[PDB]
Amino acid sequence: NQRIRIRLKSFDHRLIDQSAQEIVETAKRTGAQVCGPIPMPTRIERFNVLTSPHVNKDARDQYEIRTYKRLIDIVQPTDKTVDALMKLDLAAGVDVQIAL
Amino acid sequence: AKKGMINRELKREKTVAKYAAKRAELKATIANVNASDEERFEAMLKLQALPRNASPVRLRNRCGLTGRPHGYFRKFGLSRNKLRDTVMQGDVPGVVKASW
Amino acid sequence: PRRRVVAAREILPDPKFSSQTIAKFMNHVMQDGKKSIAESIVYGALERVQEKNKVDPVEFFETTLEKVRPMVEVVPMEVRPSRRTALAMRWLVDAAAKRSEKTMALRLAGELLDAAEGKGAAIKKREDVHRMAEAN
Amino acid sequence: GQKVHPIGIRLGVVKRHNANWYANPKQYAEYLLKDLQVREFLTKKLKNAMVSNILIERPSGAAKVTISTARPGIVIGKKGEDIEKLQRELTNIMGVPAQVSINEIDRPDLDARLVAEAIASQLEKRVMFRRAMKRAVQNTMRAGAKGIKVEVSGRLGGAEIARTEWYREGRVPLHTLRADIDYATMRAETTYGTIGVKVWIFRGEILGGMKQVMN
Amino acid sequence: TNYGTGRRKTATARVFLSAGTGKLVINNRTLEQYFGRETARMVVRQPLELLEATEKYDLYITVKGGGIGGQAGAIRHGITRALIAADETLKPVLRQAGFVTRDAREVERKKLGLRKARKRPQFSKR
Amino acid sequence: PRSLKKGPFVDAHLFAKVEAAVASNSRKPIKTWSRRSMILPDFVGLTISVHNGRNHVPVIVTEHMVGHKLGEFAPTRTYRGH
RNA sequence: CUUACCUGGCCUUGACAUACUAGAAACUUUUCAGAGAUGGAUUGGUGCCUUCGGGAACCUAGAUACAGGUGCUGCAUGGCUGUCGUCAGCUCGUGUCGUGAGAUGUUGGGUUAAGUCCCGCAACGAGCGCAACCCUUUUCCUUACUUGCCAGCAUUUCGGAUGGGAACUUUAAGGAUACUGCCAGUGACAAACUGGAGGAAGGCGGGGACGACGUCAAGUCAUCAUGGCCCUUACGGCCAGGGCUACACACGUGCUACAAUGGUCGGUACAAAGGGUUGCUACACAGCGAUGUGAUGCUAAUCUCAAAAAGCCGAUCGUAGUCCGGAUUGGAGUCUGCAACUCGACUCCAUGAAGUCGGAAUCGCUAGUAAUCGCGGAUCAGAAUGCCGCGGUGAAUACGUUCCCG
């Protein structure tokens, strides 16, 4: 009863789905059943920044940043699956957490 | 800001870091129920006898580039002017103009 | 506006009597979005008039409305039909507000019955409009 | 009135960010401050090497700095000593091992930063500003851009009253979000003060959106 | 048997329609227990009273989100969609009554420099 | 007010001075800048020169003053009318 | 503290840089005087490379080029911003007319949110502006099935709680759809305009971002950078206390009320978005309460802040300065913090001010808007009636351009 949990975090959804698709494709090639990827709710943070150097309270820029999360489950893992997962490259801008 | 103010901030940070451990020890001893009332009382006296700059409440957040004491935005560590300039140049990963 | 003609906003019929007149009266009574309180006030008065004379609530209300309806404003000119009803409801709520009784519903029913015999501040204001129209 | 930053307004539309890494909220500030220090240090050191773009990445507990330059030989060094020294200083500043990579620009006249740097150098060498502007605009248009606008502001020629002069050939559709517009700003420090230089270059409209751009 | 989904002001209602005596439960509650004000009860019942079919169907309803008015509107929309799915010939009558339209009105966001969506702070020439 | 579980607050340098005077019997006013110190029962009968931002004003401690801060008897702002 | 101001106490190549000369690991313990800055004694350690004759940081001593300045000039400047104003205009090349500066095109007739589009016309052609490309919301499809969901089956302590299911809601990536597409009438017969069907949506469906050529010697030398002028035992640097919180007055922007469409008490329903490891805390005990103690889960679609409030049902108050209002003051406390006197927030008991809907005048708003009700965040040890967001309930009126403003 060994299950592998993969969590992906990023600031760029196109990157995060590219990485998730690559991981899923590799796992399917190795010969293990996978579940996902499952999109978790996105986090959004906003800021209001005054633009003028001295006094204009109504002159502000509104910025935002988003955090995207993906969840992937691997069930019935073959022996080659794990070593393939550490052989898999790490792309900048996407953070990966693996739990056994 | 001025070099004197920046150096003052640096000195206060150094003092807080130096005295961090003993302050926590004395506070835990004061909170200790099993310890005697006398133990707690001399612990409180020693805490009051510690130097003033050892207290974290005297630290003020300043911009990491200019030293400005207003508009700090803990998440980036920069004041509003530098945050605007750098975000609009594109050196902050993930931050974009917000509309909804 | 200046260039366009804006259509009037159609209001839904009252879900209990299917009466746009009753719905408009409820909207005139309602304050700051409290529709439930206005519904209670209007329905209580409609039931009270039904008990104190066994008449249909809708018909009795239309007849009283036509009695308290003006015919002219003020320069004399003929008031369009919608403004007639809008002005009659305002008079009927304003004058009903000033009576002394336990609840707004009872005051509304009481002055509806009073106006059905032509006795009320709303009808007096109507006669005032008649006089000042004779003035012009 | 005032105009929005051409790169900032397109940072998520047709443009890529200059920093590509992820960090938790605790480490975000430290990472950003070290990145800014790295950028300032590199800008100071490579002043005469024709460097326009610096891209910083943090793939896995390490750093990768890509420098876009028109003087790859000068940047690299005689035998590669300069790149290894640069790696040492960058690792020292950043606290993690760092890899420097070089991307060579083959069309320098289509880079907004290099044109502004050249114009500012000429202004500091006190050539007449209208000649400098016309020469730069003609050179870029011959190079093959579809439009370029150049603006200079300040005490032009040493006059006691500052003013602003601009010059444009071609097409510059600033309100089109899908247009590819490079923008640059620079300072010329003359005996009579600061002169500001701004350059816009238009290189055609990008089609397919950010899906095509492959963020 | 038949299924419908209704939406109104961030409220979503799932409606399951069958043939039966006329039982109606909302979130394992009766209509009078769930809705306190009479108009909310009338809005829910409007489609069946219009069709004169108050007695031939059984309803199983769940609903989440929004307030009482939004939930009543969502339930009405879901019942209408369930009836349409059960019989396509009923669509003209319900469309004429106006029940098939999804009301897309929604709360407008607050805007920078304003107290509300449109309300502006008080201003003075003097 | 300060929480009762912590007790009253007195500056150590002022406490040492008053304790030394009471162990002795010196009537010399105690010069201090500690406007924040609490007046204790040992203070009664003593003269304390409290700083008020510009000067040192003398205060003679009586029984009724116990439980107050030293600064309440040294006003810091000057006002006589408009 | 911030702090740039005042009183008093101190330092002088300086709190910080480079360049030169010598000596030391750096660091570390314990005290004494002092309001502190500081000054004096007092311990341990004395380290890392080495072609090892010295070097790497780091500290101390001397010397002078210098540092330092939130000092002045926004009327010397860069950069950044407001405003007219989301106003609809601003230009260029060939050809014609004029001695010429110039004109024409860009005018004239309809129309539009728009120099938006169509006609005529010594004109024929182009760029920046408008519109579209970007984000969000409304209908449907595909992929994805956990921490989220529960239609059918089974077990249930009746709690999706448990097997289980991939239907539905939702979550979030990619797509489809709306284009005067169809019909009728009009306008010129064009641009268009009006009415009808279907459709979730019909003529720009709703909202956001995006602000042309230019004006105001508009604002900022106190974010920053920078020409010039000024100080150098002080206009620089360190410290304790005070002030920025004053108070016969005037003005601007707000909050709470003057009550019955209400106040109080008991019972009982329905959200969205956002935050949480120096943090948020289930539950139990103690307290009238703010809170305290023990303890549990959570690095979070998993645990938590968290009680939504207005709403509905029942009782009572009966028009009174009141069972309205909640200022002010007296007395007890809690928490953060080295420290709540000047000068914090909150809790309990007592007190119970003006206020009876407010002159001349003046402001905002055309639909999920106004009005009203609650909830969250940035800043932040603590300290919002401000600011930036989120949802609940949910109106009235537009005949028209005669006058007011632009």
From Swiss-Prot, chain B:
> Which sequence ranges are marked TM in the entry?
none
Q: Name one GO molecular function term.
A: rRNA binding
A Gene Ontology biological process noted in the UniProt record is: translation
List keywords of the entry alphabetically: Ribonucleoprotein, Ribosomal protein, RNA-binding, rRNA-binding
**Gene3D superfamilies tied to this protein:** 1.10.287.1480
Q: Which GO terms describe its cellular component?
A: cytoplasm; small ribosomal subunit
| NCBIfam families associated with the record | PRK08881.1 (NF006477)
On subunit structure and binding partners, the annotation says: Part of the 30S ribosomal subunit. Contacts proteins S3 and S10.
Listed PANTHER family: 30S RIBOSOMAL PROTEIN S14 (PTHR19836), SMALL RIBOSOMAL SUBUNIT PROTEIN US14M (PTHR19836:SF19)
Biological role:
Binds 16S rRNA, required for the assembly of 30S particles and may also be responsible for determining the conformation of the 16S rRNA at the A site.
Q: Which family does it belong to?
A: Belongs to the universal ribosomal protein uS14 family.
Indicate what this protein is called per its UniProt record.
Small ribosomal subunit protein uS14
Provide the species name.
Answer: Acinetobacter baumannii (strain AB0057)
From Swiss-Prot, chain C:
Coiled-coil blocks: none
Q: Name one GO biological process term.
A: translation
Q: Which Pfam families does this entry report, sorted A to Z? A: Ribosomal_S7 (PF00177)
CDD domains linked to this entry: uS7_Bacteria (cd14869)
Which Gene3D superfamilies does this UniProt record tie to the protein? Ribosomal protein S7 domain
Q: Which SUPFAM superfamilies match?
A: Ribosomal protein S7
Q: Which GO terms describe its cellular component?
A: small ribosomal subunit
State the InterPro entries in the record.
Ribosomal_uS7, Ribosomal_uS7_bac/org-type, Ribosomal_uS7_CS, Ribosomal_uS7_dom, Ribosomal_uS7_dom_sf
HAMAP family in alphabetical order? Ribosomal_uS7_B (MF_00480_B)
Q: Quote the NCBIfam families the UniProt record gives.
A: rpsG_bact
Task: Summarize subunit and interaction data from the UniProt record for this chain.
Answer: Part of the 30S ribosomal subunit. Contacts proteins S9 and S11.
Primary role: One of the primary rRNA binding proteins, it binds directly to 16S rRNA where it nucleates assembly of the head domain of the 30S subunit. Is located at the subunit interface close to the decoding center, probably blocks exit of the E-site tRNA.
- Specify the protein name: Small ribosomal subunit protein uS7
Tell me which species this is from: Acinetobacter baumannii (strain AB0057)
Lineage, highest ranks first: Bacteria, Pseudomonadati, Pseudomonadota, Gammaproteobacteria, Moraxellales
From Swiss-Prot, chain F:
Q: Which GO terms describe its biological process?
A: ribosomal small subunit assembly; translation
Q: Which GO terms describe its molecular function?
A: rRNA binding; structural constituent of ribosome
Q: Which cysteines are joined by disulfide bonds?
A: none
User: What Gene3D superfamilies does its record include?
Assistant: 30s Ribosomal Protein S19, Chain A (3.30.860.10)
Q: Which UniProt keywords apply?
A: Ribonucleoprotein, Ribosomal protein, RNA-binding, rRNA-binding
Q: Which InterPro entries match?
A: Ribosomal_uS19 (IPR002222), Ribosomal_uS19_bac-type (IPR005732), Ribosomal_uS19_CS (IPR020934), Ribosomal_uS19_SF (IPR023575)
Gene Ontology CC: cytoplasm; small ribosomal subunit
Q: From what superkingdom does this record's organism come?
A: Bacteria
GTP-binding is among the record's keywords:
no
Q: List the SUPFAM superfamilies hit by this protein, alphabetically.
A: Ribosomal protein S19 (SSF54570)
Family of this protein: Belongs to the universal ribosomal protein uS19 family.
Role this protein plays:
Protein S19 forms a complex with S13 that binds strongly to the 16S ribosomal RNA.
| Protein name per Swiss-Prot or TrEMBL | Small ribosomal subunit protein uS19
Origin species, per record, is: Acinetobacter baumannii (strain AB0057)
